[PDB]
Each structure stands twice: as structure tokens, then as C-alpha cells.
Amino acid sequence: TLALIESAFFVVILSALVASLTINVLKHHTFWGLEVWKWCVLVMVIFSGMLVTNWFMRLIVFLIETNFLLRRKVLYFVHGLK
């Protein structure tokens, strides 16, 4: 539910940013003295940073699990500080 909504919002933001980069029509509009593309990119980054960080943490955990390291203290620290 919540995860699906966040993923859909991130996908929509990415598609809008790609369209703005490819099409200069959107760039012709500016808000508060700033280009619309910059604001769209900032909003997309704000709304997708959580998902990006979660994916990065999952990848790091997967890499650590495949690694030969098996110390209990290191695993506990990683789990606590993730």
C-alpha cells in the first residue's frame, strides 16, 4: 500500500524529469525565479531519496551476507545502525 504509492510517485517524478530534460517546453516555465526543471528534480530527489537509500542498504546487507565476515558484533552493529 504505502510502499506501492511511494514507488509510483518516484516513477512519476523520474518520468517527469526525463520528459523535462528531453523536451525544452517544460524548461520554458520558471517558478519563483528558478527553472521548473530544477524544482522538479529537487522534488523527485526529496521523494525518492528514502527508496534509494533503502535499496542501497539492502544491497549492502546482501553483499555483507555473501562476504566471508561472520562476526556477531559486526552484524549486530549493522542491524542496529542500518
From Swiss-Prot:
Membrane-spanning parts: 1-19, 31-51
Q: What is this protein called?
A: Mechanosensitive ion channel protein 10
Q: What does this protein do?
A: Mechanosensitive channel that opens in response to stretch forces in the membrane lipid bilayer.
Provide the tissue specificity: Detected in the root tip and throughout the vasculature of the root and leaf.
Name its cellular compartments: Cell membrane
> Family assignment?
Belongs to the MscS (TC 1.A.23) family.
